[PDB]
Amino acid sequence: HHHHHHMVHITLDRNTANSWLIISKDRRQVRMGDTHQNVSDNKERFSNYPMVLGAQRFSSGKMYWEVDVTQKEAWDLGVCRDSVQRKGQFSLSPENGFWTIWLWQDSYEAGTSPQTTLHIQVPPCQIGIFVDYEAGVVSFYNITDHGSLIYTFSECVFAGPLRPFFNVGFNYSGGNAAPLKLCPL
Ligand SMILES: CCc1ncc(CNC)s1
């Protein structure tokens, strides 16, 4: 792909984070803590899952960023509406305001309803995410495999400002402690 020139500097919004997440001082890395991280509760925090939003809001244009997923067993990445539900249980789907892919139990899937099997021959260490607001497109690229396409959501009905979306996943296994990292331009 040739989307690299739409690169945007994404930073994480502490105030949206689940209370067990640890966000680095530069706001470019997030990982699961082994306990509550001693923050006050607020209506923005994702309560049920280890999720956090980027600070940036997009309502136009073309945007591209990259995320490092090295050695993780489970994660969700993509974009979501600024107004997605924060509390209680919910599915990641466009009907609920999410445009996401994930890794879970050694398989990759796109967050459609129902979910779609992805075909990845080279497990990615870094994922590229491309958003074209006007076109209604969210695309995912395998940086480890020369930028090969993973998945395109088209005909997207964003219906609001978009925010970068992250889930570090649970760490029940002891094999999923590694962080998500926003990679340099
Ligand atoms: C969603 C908040 C959490 N409660 C317990 C957690 C620890 N499990 C890996 S994370």
C-beta atoms surrounding 12 within 10 Å: 23
Q: Dihedrals φ, ψ of 6, to 5°?
A: -90, 15
CA of 2 to the centre of ligand 1 (A): 38
Size (the chain), residues = 185
Q: How far is the CA of 123 from the centre of ligand 1 (A)?
A: 26
Full DSSP string of 12-67: EEGGGS-TTEEE-TTSSEEEE-SS--S----TTS-SSSSEEEES--BSSSEEEEEE
* CA 169 – ligand 1 centroid, Å: 9
- Cβ pair 53, 25 in contact under 8 A: no
Cis? peptide before 123, omega within 30° of 0:
no
**Which atom number of ligand 1 is nearest to the Cα of residue 49?**
1
Check if the beta carbon of residue 126 is closer than 8 Å to that of residue 67.
Answer: yes
In this structure, the residue with its CA closest to atom 4 of ligand 1 is 20
Tell me, in angstroms, the distance from the centre of ligand 1 to residue 20's CA.
6
* Domain interval for residue 87: 4-182
Q: Whose CA is nearest to atom 10 of ligand 1?
A: 20
> Do residues 130 and 64 touch, judged by C-beta distance below 8 A?
yes
Helix residue ranges, H only, 43-158: none
- The sign of the torsion formed by the CA atoms of 111, 114, 119, 122 equals positive
Task: State in Å: Cα 172 to ligand 1 middle.
Answer: 9
Q: Whose CA is nearest to atom 3 of ligand 1?
A: 20
Looking at residue 7, the DSSP 8-state letter turns out to be B
What is the rounded CA–CA span in Å between residue 111 and residue 114?
Answer: 8
Q: Pocket around ligand 1: residues whose beta carbon is below 6 Å from it?
A: 18, 20, 32, 48-50, 170-172
> What whole-number distance in Å separates Cα of residue 132 and Cα of residue 63?
7
Number of domains within the chain: 1
Q: Method of determination?
A: X-ray
**CATH number of the structural domain spanning residue 78:** 2.60.120.920
State this model's resolution in angstroms. 1.4
- Closest-CA residue to 110 (of 126, 99, 123): 99
Q: How many CB atoms lie within 10 A of CB 38?
A: 7
